[PDB]
């Protein structure tokens, strides 16, 4: 099993804006308690699930746990890359699996809810906190 994506970087700055705060407190909150949230709350354990070719095909793995801990530690710079992480999770599920599979339908429902919630995003980004690299 490959290591999970980093959630903190000493060479990267730490930023918190109103949109990232919203993504953590509303979007990630409401997608975490969704009924179809469990297959995307952990990194894909390709060893354990008989999926040896998974990381040949998913070159950027992503899960709601990694995104959650990235938002908690203020690892992101702005909201766009957190939204990109969510979209990468959904697209990883899509590319890896088949359009009629149950997990693809679950990811599609999650993505629809996510797109609604991010449509409810604050339009103007306001910086709350910034810390330079250590």
């Amino acid at each position: 099993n490959p290591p999970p994506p980093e959630t903190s970087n000493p060479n990267k700055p730490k930023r918190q804006t109103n949109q990232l705060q919203y993504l953590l407190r509303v979007v990630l909150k409401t997608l975490w308690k969704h009924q179809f949230a469990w297959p995307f709350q952990q990194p894909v354990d390709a060893v354990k699930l008989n999926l040896p070719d998974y990381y040949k095909i998913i070159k950027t793995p992503m899960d709601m746990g990694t995104i959650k801990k990235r938002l908690e530690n203020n690892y992101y710079w702005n909201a766009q890359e957190c939204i990109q992480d969510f979209n990468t999770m959904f697209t990883n599920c899509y590319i890896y699996n088949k359009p009629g599979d149950d997990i693809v339908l679950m990811a599609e429902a999650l993505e629809k809810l996510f797109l609604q919630k991010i449509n409810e995003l604050p339009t103007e980004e306001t910086e709350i906190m910034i810390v330079q690299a250590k």
Partner: peptide, 12 residues
């Protein structure tokens, strides 16, 4: 573990 095959099902 029974509650594991449920994981292995929705990721054929």
């Amino acid at each position: 573990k029974p509650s594991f095959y449920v994981y292995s099902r929705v990721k054929n």
